[PDB]
Amino acid sequence: PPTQMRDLTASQLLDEITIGWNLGNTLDATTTSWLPNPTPAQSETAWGCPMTTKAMIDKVKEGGFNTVRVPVSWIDHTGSAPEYQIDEAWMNRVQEVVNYVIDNDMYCILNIHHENDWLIPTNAQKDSVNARLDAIWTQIATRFGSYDEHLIFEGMNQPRLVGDPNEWNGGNQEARQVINSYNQTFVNTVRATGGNNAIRCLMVPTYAASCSSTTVNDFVLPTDTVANKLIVDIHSYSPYNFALNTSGTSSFTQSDISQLQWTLQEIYNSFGAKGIPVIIGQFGALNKNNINGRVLWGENYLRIAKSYNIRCIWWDNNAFDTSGENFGLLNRGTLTWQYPELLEAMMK
Numbered sequence: 001p002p003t004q005m006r007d008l009t010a011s012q013l014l015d016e017i018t019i020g021w022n023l024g025n026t027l028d029a030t031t032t033s034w035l036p037n038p039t040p041a042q043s044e045t046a047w048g049c050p051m052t053t054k055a056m057i058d059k060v061k062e063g064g065f066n067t068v069r070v071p072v073s074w075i076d077h078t079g080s081a082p083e084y085q086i087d088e089a090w091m092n093r094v095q096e097v098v099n100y101v102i103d104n105d106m107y108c109i110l111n112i113h114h115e116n117d118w119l120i121p122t123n124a125q126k127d128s129v130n131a132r133l134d135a136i137w138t139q140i141a142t143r144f145g146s147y148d149e150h151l152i153f154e155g156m157n158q159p160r161l162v163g164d165p166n167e168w169n170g171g172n173q174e175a176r177q178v179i180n181s182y183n184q185t186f187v188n189t190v191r192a193t194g195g196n197n198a199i200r201c202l203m204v205p206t207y208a209a210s211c212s213s214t215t216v217n218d219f220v221l222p223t224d225t226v227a228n229k230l231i232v233d234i235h236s237y238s239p240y241n242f243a244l245n246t247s248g249t250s251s252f253t254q255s256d257i258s259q260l261q262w263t264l265q266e267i268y269n270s271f272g273a274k275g276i277p278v279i280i281g282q283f284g285a286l287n288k289n290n291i292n293g294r295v296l297w298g299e300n301y302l303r304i305a306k307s308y309n310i311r312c313i314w315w316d317n318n319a320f321d322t323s324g325e326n327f328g329l330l331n332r333g334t335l336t337w338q339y340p341e342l343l344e345a346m347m348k
């Protein structure tokens, strides 16, 4: 039966969120290019993370987060068209992990993540993609339909033109248009299940979850069956060279605060100031053995974001000193905060 649910607007729900944490490189890990039919365990552990436990989520809450984003890649667990049946064992594991969060009295965001092999924003793919989106979102929404307002569905992650010269610079006009259709389908698909899903808050991204003039001007918030339940998700690993470029500078100084203020103000001006709720569903700064700079960056990022009433969700991929992107914060195997000064900076 349905869990009793508070009917709150998106703004009201966002005002209950403090700061969030992503379970990164976990249920979002893909194996598509070498293992077509992974078991749930093969997927969850494919990218350097152990099997998730309740104790890990307990530690996230203890550290000061009250929200967990659970990115999930469904592609390697989805059957053939037209049913696109999701593997039952996978759906069961996703629910187990969601429950680690929900049963901790936390907010939880559940999405579809690395789907770009099929989630292609072109007119030629549009009808096929809308059909698959509806097929998979009906399955996810019905499994999770009984949950209360603490569970938020996010319809897509970073829809984009993979391999395009402007993949990460707004794509093209056609792609931005088609993404509006995909977000509209997602909203319609969830509302069609009724119950608590009729009044659940839902999150939708812009093109590549990017905030720029190009992606904002062409973005259309879906039409909804209920008022004030939609939130835009922007990922903002800013400033790029410091935070996300593995070859970029490791320095962040007083002089960089002004560019960060401008970047975050642009998110506010594009959405929150216009009465469109917005959340930074992923941010972070790579470990470059630069703790003083990351502490200064982190204190100011959260201070400025809060000053614009924008909640933030750290991207934690459990990676510290690898040759890849090291966005770890919680060392999941030791249950230790590896960068305590940075955690403290973001929690003040």
Ligand SMILES: OC[C@H]1O[C@@H](O[C@H]2[C@H](O)[C@@H](O)[C@H](O[C@H]3[C@H](O)[C@@H](O)[C@@H](O)O[C@@H]3CO)O[C@@H]2CO)[C@H](O)[C@@H](O)[C@@H]1O
Pocket (backbone or CB within 6 Å): 024, 025, 028, 046, 047, 048, 157, 158, 235, 282, 315, 317, 324, 325, 327
């Ligand atoms: O090392 C394990 C595995 O890592 C894969 O790269 C990951 C990054 O580690 C991860 O930080 C990144 O996270 C991105 C997130 O999924 C996006 O939503 C977006 O906001 O940007 C984040 C930061 O880049 O995802 C990638 C995967 O796309 C390697 O691809 C893989 O080869 C390797 O085994």
